Amino acid sequence: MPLPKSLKYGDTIGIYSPSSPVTYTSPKRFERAKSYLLQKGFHILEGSLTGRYDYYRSGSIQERAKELNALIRNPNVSCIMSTIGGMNSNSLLPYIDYDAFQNNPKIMIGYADATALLLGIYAKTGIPTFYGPALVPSFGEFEPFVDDTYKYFLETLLHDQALPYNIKQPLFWSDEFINWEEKTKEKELRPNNWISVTNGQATGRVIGGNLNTIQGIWGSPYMPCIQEGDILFIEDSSKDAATIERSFSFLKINGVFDKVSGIILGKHEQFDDCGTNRKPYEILLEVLQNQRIPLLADFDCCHTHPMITMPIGVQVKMDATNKTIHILEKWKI
Amino acid sequence: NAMPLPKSLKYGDTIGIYSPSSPVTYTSPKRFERAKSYLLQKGFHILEGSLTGRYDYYRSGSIQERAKELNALIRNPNVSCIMSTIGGMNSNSLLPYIDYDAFQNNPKIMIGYADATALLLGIYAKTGIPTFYGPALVPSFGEFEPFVDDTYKYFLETLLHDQALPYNIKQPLFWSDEFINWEEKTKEKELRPNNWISVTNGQATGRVIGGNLNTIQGIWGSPYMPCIQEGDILFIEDSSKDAATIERSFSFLKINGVFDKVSGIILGKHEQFDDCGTNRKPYEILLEVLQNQRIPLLADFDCCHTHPMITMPIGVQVKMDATNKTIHILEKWKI
Ligand SMILES: Nc1ncnc2c1ncn2[C@@H]1O[C@H](COP(=O)(O)O)[C@@H](O)[C@H]1O
Numbered sequence A: 001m002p003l004p005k006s007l008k009y010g011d012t013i014g015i016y017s018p019s020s021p022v023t024y025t026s027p028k029r030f031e032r033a034k035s036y037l038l039q040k041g042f043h044i045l046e047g048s049l050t051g052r053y054d055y056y057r058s059g060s061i062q063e064r065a066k067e068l069n070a071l072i073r074n075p076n077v078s079c080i081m082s083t084i085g086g087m088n089s090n091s092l093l094p095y096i097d098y099d100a101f102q103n104n105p106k107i108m109i110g111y112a113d114a115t116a117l118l119l120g121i122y123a124k125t126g127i128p129t130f131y132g133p134a135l136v137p138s139f140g141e142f143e144p145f146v147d148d149t150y151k152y153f154l155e156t157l158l159h160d161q162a163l164p165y166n167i168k169q170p171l172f173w174s175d176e177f178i179n180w181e182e183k184t185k186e187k188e189l190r191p192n193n194w195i196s197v198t199n200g201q202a203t204g205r206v207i208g209g210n211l212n213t214i215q216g217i218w219g220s221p222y223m224p225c226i227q228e229g230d231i232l233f234i235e236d237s238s239k240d241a242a243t244i245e246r247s248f249s250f251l252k253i254n255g256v257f258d259k260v261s262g263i264i265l266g267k268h269e270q271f272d273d274c275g276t277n278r279k280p281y282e283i284l285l286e287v288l289q290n291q292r293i294p295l296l297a298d299f300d301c302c303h304t305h306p307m308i309t310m311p312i313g314v315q316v317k318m319d320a321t322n323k324t325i326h327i328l329e330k331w332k333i
Numbered sequence B: 001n002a003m004p005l006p007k008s009l010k011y012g013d014t015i016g017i018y019s020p021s022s023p024v025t026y027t028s029p030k031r032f033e034r035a036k037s038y039l040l041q042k043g044f045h046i047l048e049g050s051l052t053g054r055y056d057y058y059r060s061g062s063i064q065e066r067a068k069e070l071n072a073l074i075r076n077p078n079v080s081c082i083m084s085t086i087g088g089m090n091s092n093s094l095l096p097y098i099d100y101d102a103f104q105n106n107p108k109i110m111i112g113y114a115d116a117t118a119l120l121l122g123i124y125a126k127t128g129i130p131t132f133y134g135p136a137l138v139p140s141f142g143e144f145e146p147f148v149d150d151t152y153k154y155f156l157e158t159l160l161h162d163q164a165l166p167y168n169i170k171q172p173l174f175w176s177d178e179f180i181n182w183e184e185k186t187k188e189k190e191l192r193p194n195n196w197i198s199v200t201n202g203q204a205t206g207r208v209i210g211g212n213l214n215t216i217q218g219i220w221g222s223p224y225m226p227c228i229q230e231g232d233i234l235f236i237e238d239s240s241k242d243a244a245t246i247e248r249s250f251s252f253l254k255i256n257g258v259f260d261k262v263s264g265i266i267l268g269k270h271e272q273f274d275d276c277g278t279n280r281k282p283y284e285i286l287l288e289v290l291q292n293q294r295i296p297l298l299a300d301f302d303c304c305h306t307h308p309m310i311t312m313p314i315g316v317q318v319k320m321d322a323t324n325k326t327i328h329i330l331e332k333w334k335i
């Protein structure tokens, strides 16, 4: 497994907008996010589409691919981070310079729609990528949560890590819908718990990301093939019960649950239960139909705050019963 | 090497109805009753599925209940046609539990659209029997005059009447995607002069495969999605999405190499499309995704959520002429 170099203070983080033009539509949170990382001691290299607006997206398919490729090809950039998600990252996949990435591996990080690029790069190059902070939603967050997200960010990308790296459960979380551009209030601290939905243990390569986004790359050369023993990691956000039942069944009929040895389900930001008062793992439970797969839910790697940074494509040990996650193989130098 | 085809619909036949997703018979009782009465006055009998009237919020019932409802119709010898009441999100849940052996033992006309695409394509993939992208009971036959009469005409001409081949699918003269007159009629829908669009000139002949594109992403890669083969004609439609969503869906097809295989594309109208302020039409977004690849493309085809609705067989040879805006079915889809 070829690995990216650890982040170091003084390094340059290159940012790009593969989908929504957030640097145009949310300039205050964008500037706040840049300033936050600059103060920590990282430089920011703004991609070529920063500040541009093409309505639902930052620019054309070709322009977006060029923005990302310029960062991949830049030897001065140690980390490539999406500004935010959207719907349209998968449009870039045919045009990405995977050979340039494989020849000099970098840290590739982000979440939600950026899953298309995280998984595509992993599928094409075999280099682990990272489900974690996007610049504007994650680092543009006000105190206190941004500081917890940052701690996880350093733990995975910067710290010399004694293995196994036990991913520690944050004490509090929030999916509260406020304080986007300007801080009007204080976010309620939700006491936190991971859920032991189905007891057991699994070890294998972790694969996954945003499930809604995965259905946009499924079956293509850019979706890594799920293998027997893999641990499936999935999260969704701001969907309703109908939508996630379809996504869960999509996995079911593709025979994914006949393959994976365990499941980690993220919290679901602003979930719409359609009046059923059922939680997402419950809907997943119906789809599974009493197939015993260890299942740990409400994992904090998703649209809720704070956010863990998770390596994708490396061996992991999940213990749903004892509610632990350990990274058992090196994801960086 | 010929194939099993469902028997043609005939007057007095029983149409079994089921709700594979949304509980529309509970939430829209006026349009449900009106749709049923429309088909009854035409001389058809209706067999209500076991989940009729029931309400489980976003769905008609549990996964097992819904598979049971549909399988009861499939295993019933007196049902000649199985029609969904309406779509939703959750038809794909049923796929592992459907009795495909029973269906293939006594093939029926399977018809519906939107979310029901999961089942139409699932059954075709498993049994090789053509299925039909066409009316669902409540949205299609619950429609007030005049449009319901056009939808019925195409339904009949395709499923009941004897048809010589090639069979010309005629362009409706008027259409509407107006969001009104659901339960009660408060005004007349605008009769919009209709046109199919020649987006990219040319002709294609091949097996037509497709349906609701959003729903196809829920069965993709599974045993229930028929494999797209070289030469196929891709038929796709979506409804009530925005530009961002359909770019994702078009790129999904692109990165799966679908456009490297198909000989042509038929794109349905897009009911209540949200262009996100771009003023772009769905086919212009598709064309960007296609980049420098040239593919004959006929758009605004009337087999989708707009009214009236054409009934289209899936899995049979078709000729599309995008230049002259014609579609012909070249192969028997029924007996
Ligand atoms: N106006 C807003 N108010 C509150 N939260 C927002 C707003 N716009 C975007 N967000 C959040 O920003 C994040 C963007 O996620 P994604 O767009 O899927 O990459 C989600 O957590 C959204 O809830």
Ligand SMILES: Nc1ncnc2c1ncn2[C@@H]1O[C@H](COP(=O)(O)O)[C@@H](O)[C@H]1O
Residues within 6 Å of the ligand: B022, B086, B087, B088, B113, B114, B115, B139, B179, B180, B181, B182, B239, B240, B271, B305
């Ligand atoms: N309240 C409503 N008013 C008008 N049209 C509706 C309403 N509810 C549903 N419809 C129509 O019914 C269709 C249902 O299709 P689907 O849910 O996609 O299978 C929608 O796309 C609309 O065209």
